[PDB]
Symmetry: C2
Subunit: 620 residues, 2 copies
Amino acid sequence: ASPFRLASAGEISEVQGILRTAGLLGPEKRIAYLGVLDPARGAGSEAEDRRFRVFIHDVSGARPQEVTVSVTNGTVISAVELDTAATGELPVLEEEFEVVEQLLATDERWLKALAARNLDVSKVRVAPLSAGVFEYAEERGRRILRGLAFVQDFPEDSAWAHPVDGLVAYVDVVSKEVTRVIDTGVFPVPAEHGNYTDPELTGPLRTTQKPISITQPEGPSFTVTGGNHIEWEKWSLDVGFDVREGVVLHNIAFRDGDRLRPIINRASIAEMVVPYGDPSPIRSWQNYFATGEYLVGQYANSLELGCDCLGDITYLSPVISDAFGNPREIRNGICMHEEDWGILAKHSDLWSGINYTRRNRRMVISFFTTIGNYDYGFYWYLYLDGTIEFEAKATGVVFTSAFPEGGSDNISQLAPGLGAPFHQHIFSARLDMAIDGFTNRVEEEDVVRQTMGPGNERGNAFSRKRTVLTRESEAVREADARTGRTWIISNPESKNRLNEPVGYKLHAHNQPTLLADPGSSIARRAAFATKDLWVTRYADDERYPTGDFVNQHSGGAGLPSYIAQDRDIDGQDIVVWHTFGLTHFPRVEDWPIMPVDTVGFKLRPEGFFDRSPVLDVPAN
Amino acid sequence: ASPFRLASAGEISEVQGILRTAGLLGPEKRIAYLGVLDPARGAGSEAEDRRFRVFIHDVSGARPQEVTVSVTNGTVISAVELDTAATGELPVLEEEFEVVEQLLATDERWLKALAARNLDVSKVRVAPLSAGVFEYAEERGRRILRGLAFVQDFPEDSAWAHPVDGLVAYVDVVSKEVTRVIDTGVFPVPAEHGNYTDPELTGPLRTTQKPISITQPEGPSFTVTGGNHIEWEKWSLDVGFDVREGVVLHNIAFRDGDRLRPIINRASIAEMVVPYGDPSPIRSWQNYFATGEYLVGQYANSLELGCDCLGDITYLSPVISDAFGNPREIRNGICMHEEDWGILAKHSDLWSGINYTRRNRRMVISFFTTIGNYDYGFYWYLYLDGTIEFEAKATGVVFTSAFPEGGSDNISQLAPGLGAPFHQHIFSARLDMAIDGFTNRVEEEDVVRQTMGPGNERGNAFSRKRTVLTRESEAVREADARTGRTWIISNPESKNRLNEPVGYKLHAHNQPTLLADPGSSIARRAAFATKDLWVTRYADDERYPTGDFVNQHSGGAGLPSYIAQDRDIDGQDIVVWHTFGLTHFPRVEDWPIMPVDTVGFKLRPEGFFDRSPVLDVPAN
Ligand SMILES: [Cu+2]
Ligand SMILES: [Cu+2]
């Protein structure tokens, strides 16, 4: 029914059938990406034609293809051959990651490197990482993965505690060749284990934690209809899921009186990159785009009740395609629940004698993914007062290396001889805005200090200024915490009762952006990460800040290319791209398993309503 | 038993008796401040002498006094006459705020101003505010309060909705004279009411919220002994309460194996200033130090179970003295409870096949105070991983004015003709550090970008740098969000197993600091608010960043004076003073009652432990 419904197992199977029938999915083909296409702007087609987009990989080396199909009409709408050496390789297949360790196990150079370190190949695990784009001419036209070694002493051992430094190998996953084996020298392999479930390391488990029971006797306050349409405390939205981006929120709107007022048309984390800052040749190439290269939704965890999600939880089990086009369900991959959120508003008035207190609550929509040693949680929150917030939670096991005898300026020591290279976790939130409709504009708001003098004799006055970003070329902005800089998305054609354009204010955490030298490969490939805010004019094919094909793709696509069009964004259908991230200098406390660290952003109403929208909240 | 125990009603009664019998509490005397004194450095002297510090005001204009008494021996240890014209006026008495409206009610100038506006004097409430600035000549030596008018139509009416602009009066509360009435012109009094409990404004109340039950079948995981000593998940501390500062945390320590390791000796919000940025003569002097001038602890609210504090709550009911020395209990003034705090650590490992998830929780200690129209919540959090955090919650009703015809650059419009002047809420957290002992030092840590070239050919490297603050003259620091600046408090004499000084890292929110012109009276009186972080050498008499007698003092007192001593702070008993605040440009959504907005800071372990201190947390 709803054109925003989740993809069904049936639709996935249908796509597979359509491709097979078209002669586009024979035995040598693989689905590297498959997702449902969002409806185009405006009620074009009389009805809603369900379409899917697919990236088809060829294991024999033939050029891949991008194909769009109509599952409703059973037809291929478009199919284009891709020149990967130019526009980029398709995302990595889960089945290719396994290829690396296997191939290296039979390579003389690799075996010789392990023998030199007295390491048994059968106990050496190899972490397969994306290759990026550097100075290796032979990699032109090759589908490459780079491997870093870790020793696993036994089946349940945490290999991350035993990094094999000074060694790295490059592999052509298609031709099944080891292009290079680099050995910069033998480094002692850290000896201590990092088995956080081992009693000798955890010591006796504490028995002081009493239980906390969180329940909802009458059930949750939100309703779920059409499989993924949420209605909660005036909020309305559709919870989508894409194998690349993960959870995606659609049609976020708020009920104000007799009308449903749109706020954000589509909200997603369109990219997430983890750049490493260790200049060692062994890892200086290390940068993985979880979203763009790996597809985070694909690795979403099945969330356990009471453990991952506590309270009255309503689950969604999104379906994705496997490498052959078969539907695969991610059971309980999405948690949805509401939670108490402290005091919302409070005032004890002496004159009126009235004491008033109201509590707040928020709707939570989340999923958690695992990328090798890292695990990331994605959380979207909706508050009673109209605030929208996103929060990323980073945990898992830190990527390790050896710790240099002479110390290091780019690595921290976690244990004897065990290092943790410095790195960042930078996200890009793509917010297709729709403040009271699609006619929107962005204003940069700065606090303004005033000089003592005429009109300000006491020197106490302070103000603010707003600058409307009118063209894309002027919409690449930097944060400025010192001046309390924020960005307001308003609708110049929709005013509140005080005759002011309605709006929402974006509050950033103002964390450092990409630190890499501007001339670096990563600065170019992750250009979006160098600035805090970008505003573009909406366009169907501008989906990710890094373009459609990130794997082994040079700069040239993404935000810098979109912005160049210098389109009008003053009172138009626009998209805000907010960069935010964490800069991680690992601490001893992050070992053997790290406690969650967080980062995000939020948007609060700014003259969107005619007064507080929570005056109708009961005392309960 | 414990020298850090809360003051008892009996102790207050004893102080009253001691003062009375000593002839220091005559009919004209008033207790402007009364608090127990913390133990001095060195608890070697068995059995501590319970001493109280008292500020005695004299309503006849006679010299006030600072008296120290011993309730243990029942004697007056010291009594010093105060020269208010030199060292500042004593905190405002609750009974003085009341005299302002009463005195104005009989002043011909005031009555004429109201008559011209057709306002019934019996319906005009007067918000009594501190002098706000120091300048006027005739005010020197004179104990002044200023008054701003608001119309209350009926007993339960919210007067804040009806400000009477263009009018302000100054009152000498001791001589009981109206020194001046300034009328700059008539402004319409905003017509709409702001009664948030009126169905007319709230509309039909929501019936969509289902209950959320939060319980603890086996009780809380924390224990409370000695009335205020808390032990929870390895944490140990004493919860104190002072009429000026409110909740104060003492001896914060963490159990690491067989050792109780100290982290912070005393933590408190030593000051909180609210400067207004409207250049109008009616309010350009407006600045109130809630802590220093009003005493926030005095106005702490009684917190209702299931409303202000939800869950399994353990209350503390601190006792304070009234203006006459009588004990007054603040029933349920302090809430204490633990709450679930999502996922603590998580990792699903492919190689080991082990899936691990642990949840986090925080211990919460809080109180809420009401200062006229504003209501502020103070929250201290202790996390399982060793993190300590403070969070202030600002709510209540915004201070209003008229919204001038033609607009304003320093006031926002909340309703027809109703304005809300721009202002800030800036706090100062005084942290008497004790990282593994009193020998501490502070290092400013900045992220360091590196240029591509030799040793960094790919231009991916990035580092960090730490600068030790060795003398107070170089310990006045500013934030730098761009470089991810933080401050680490370490103990150079206590190292972790990796031979590195143990420490804790302070993460600020990097919000704007005091915006007023550098030459303003407020910039001098609240100099602490102009810089993000100050470090001083510990001293018994250096309690507040604004000095002991903030009211009507000329400026420079507190931090600027302490810092001028230029003492050694490199490996010494030091105190960190962190300035943090909110810059408020009121929104329509903040009217008629504002939803909570927050600010805070946190400190996380930085090489304090030898590995993660939460490996012993059970799965459950
Ligand atoms: Cu990290
Ligand atoms: Cu405010």
